Design a protein around this ligand. Structure first.
Ligand code: HEM
Ligand code: HEM
Ligand code: HEM
Ligand code: HEM
Lengths: 146, 141, 141, 146
């Protein structure tokens, strides 16, 4: 990516402290609460009638963890997000029919979740590096769209 | 907001479209599908091939809705209520896409109304399309 | 359109900011300059270095305007007219920038109000910053 | 910049018919008229008070041509937009302080201008190719922003 070793180290160092279980559930949940139009893809998960119904939904929590998990692997391959998400990109396109713009919504929600969790530790400079990663990730996931 | 001048420009330009609105609606969609392929994720059930009747059929409904907004330029929120509810609650089309179709509609008009598509009309049509997008996106959350 | 619950949510969250509004304002600016370097093009006359007095000051001004917006959440258009004029006719900041500041404001609020930054509050704040943005870019053309 | 051989042929063939003098000024003028806030960069150009004052301003007209000439050069180096545009990117950032978003607004206006001029010849597929190019050029002009 266009990450500085310093930015690379910042991203990586914070990620090490991430509770994937809690963060994945929270990121996906807030996505559905904040931009309710994204619920269109998760009709089968159940009652998403309320913030509470959404945050308590186990299918949401479980899928959030599957999602942050893939994210994690991409952080392990920052020099080739494209090749790492190629399969996931065509799935989201061809099978799921998910507007690639949703990748960007999710990225920003993630940043808000890291801020919420890490507080003071989520400094402007660390945020700046994470903005670059989420954009990178979002671009990789939309790359095989046609 | 749309100024009196804006309203005059729109009525005149849309006026000229006349009986081609539907053909221009179809073309705008086509241009959108090709230039911004993410937009197609909303029409997985459609034949998006060139000259598809589905697209012709849909282009006409889109053109009719714009023709209706011009007709009620002074009460757009109410004249488009229904379409706003549909887009917000049933379709749940991400708001960025409105700007993509607007852009494609301008290109379409530009390509067909050389004499009319002046800088001042181009500015009025943009503002108009932005107003329509705003309405259709007002009940999102 | 802000619902009463949204309005409650905002007042509640902003109430907690309190004497820290100015610091949060300066931090949000700092995060935007750093994350979205294009936003800096609007402040060529400022010292954009960490802890700049200019940034601290400006942080306070924005925070103060937000405070006033919360107080008149029922009448933003009128509470913010002058600001809408400044931005539209004097500063002429591209509309996309509003979304970047808004995002940095949310990031900052999240990192400072862990107990308060619930999913329901996050959504209200998001809607709120969006309404504020709308008002401020409403006289652009 | 995923320009397929065919996209590139398409871009180039049409560019063959453009009067850069002309199109340059129309695109720049249209920008100042459709997105008035962009006039902020050119208060030294004189009267921009009405569409005619803008479109017929000898200064806008001459500036537009300079811009299309620069653009023209990028089209001869589709392979290396970043390098081709590097010193201009740095100029717009550091000396001119031009928000990068302005480059995408111009790209769209230029597309409307090509449509306006070519009528039926600016087909859906030709537009798609031009859409890729102006995004490419916008990105290359924003590359050196810091
Ligand atoms: C960084 C962004 C994202 C990543 C890394 C990601 C990753 C994944 C993964 C790993 C799966 C597993 C499915 C399988 O293997 O069959 C999946 C499924 C899915 N994704 Fe994403 N995703 C992302 C963003 C989104 C967004 C924003 C949405 C819609 C709002 C979305 C919609 C879906 C849906 C509907 C499924 C199917 C789940 C199921 O099978 O019920 N994705 N995604
Ligand atoms: C100014 C912009 C728009 C107008 C005037 C408009 C208008 C309409 C109309 C009149 C219908 C038909 C509803 C019926 O069944 O009576 C419709 C449906 C639909 N629209 Fe829009 N729309 C706009 C923007 C968009 C955008 C930007 C998208 C997505 C890229 C979109 C996606 C859809 C979809 C998926 C349907 C349902 C089609 C079907 O299943 O037959 N619309 N719209
Ligand atoms: C939430 C939205 C915003 C609010 C409430 C806000 C508020 C303010 C206030 C209160 C002032 C000072 C007015 C005075 O000096 O009396 C100001 C000035 C200014 N604003 Fe904004 N603003 C917002 C968004 C933006 C954005 C997004 C940008 C550009 C990225 C921007 C650029 C400026 C600039 C350049 C100045 C003048 C600074 C100076 O020369 O001192 N504003 N704004
Ligand atoms: C395709 C995108 C663009 C290209 C290729 C381009 C190219 C150029 C060139 C070749 C120059 C003259 C350099 C010099 O004076 O040494 C220039 C100057 C300038 N550009 Fe751009 N430009 C582009 C977009 C823009 C936009 C969108 C804006 C603002 C809306 C802008 C603002 C300026 C300004 C203010 C100047 C200096 C004007 C003066 O001489 O007073 N540029 N640009």
């Amino acid at each position: 990516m266009h990450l500085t070793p310093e930015e690379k180290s910042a991203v990586t160092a914070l990620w090490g402290k991430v509770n994937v279980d809690e963060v994945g559930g929270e990121a996906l949940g807030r996505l559905l609460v904040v931009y309710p139009w994204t619920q269109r893809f998760f009709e089968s998960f159940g009652d998403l009638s309320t913030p509470d119904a959404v945050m308590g939904n186990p299918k949401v929590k479980a899928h959030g963890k599957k999602v942050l998990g893939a994210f994690s692997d991409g952080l392990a391959h920052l020099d080739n997000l494209k090749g790492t998400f190629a399969t996931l990109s065509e799935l989201h396109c061809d099978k799921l029919h998910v507007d690639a713009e949703n990748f960007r919504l999710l990225g920003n929600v993630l940043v808000c979740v890291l801020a919420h969790h890490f507080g003071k530790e989520f400094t402007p400079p660390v945020q700046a590096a994470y903005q670059k990663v989420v954009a990178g990730v979002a671009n990789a996931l939309a790359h095989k769209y046609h | 907001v749309l100024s009196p001048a804006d309203k005059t420009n729109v009525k005149a330009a849309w006026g000229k479209v006349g009986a081609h609105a539907g053909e221009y609606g179809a073309e705008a969609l086509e241009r959108m599908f090709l230039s911004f392929p993410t937009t197609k994720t909303y029409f997985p059930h459609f034949d998006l091939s060139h000259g598809s009747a589905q697209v012709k059929g849909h282009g006409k409904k889109v053109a009719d809705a714009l023709t209706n907004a011009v007709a009620h330029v002074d009460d757009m929120p109410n004249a488009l209520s229904a379409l706003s509810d549909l887009h917000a609650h049933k379709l749940r089309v991400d708001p960025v896409n409105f700007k993509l179709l607007s852009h494609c509609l301008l290109v379409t008009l530009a390509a067909h109304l050389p004499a009319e598509f002046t800088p001042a009309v181009h500015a009025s049509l943009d503002k108009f399309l932005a107003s329509v997008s705003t309405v259709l996106t007002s009940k999102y959350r």
